[PDB]
Amino acid sequence: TPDCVTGKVEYTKYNDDDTFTVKVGDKELFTNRWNLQSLLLSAQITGMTVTIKTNACHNGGGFSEVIFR
């Protein structure tokens, strides 16, 4: 499938409101869809390594496809 990398949380530069620029999983970039904060939080809270993918996944990537963990 058109997936990409993982989604841990070692630095989430927030500024937009929820989008922010996440430096986690295996890369760092802007992220917008509808509420990725809950995914970055639930991830590190429960663990910290989801799955970031789709929408390029590089410099403004990862749109609506992420696996929690």
TrEMBL record:
GO terms under biological process: symbiont-mediated hemolysis of host erythrocyte
A single Gene Ontology CC term: extracellular region
Transit peptide keyword on record: no
GO-annotated molecular function: toxin activity
This protein's UniProt keywords: Disulfide bond, Signal, Toxin, Virulence
Keyword Signal: yes
UniProt function note: The B subunit is responsible for the binding of the holotoxin to specific receptors on the target cell surface, such as globotriaosylceramide (Gb3) in human intestinal microvilli.
Assembly and oligomerization: Shiga toxin contains a single subunit A and five copies of subunit B.
Family from the record: Belongs to the StxB family.
Protein name: Shiga toxin subunit B
Organism: Escherichia coli
Residues of the full protein shown: 17 to 85 of 85
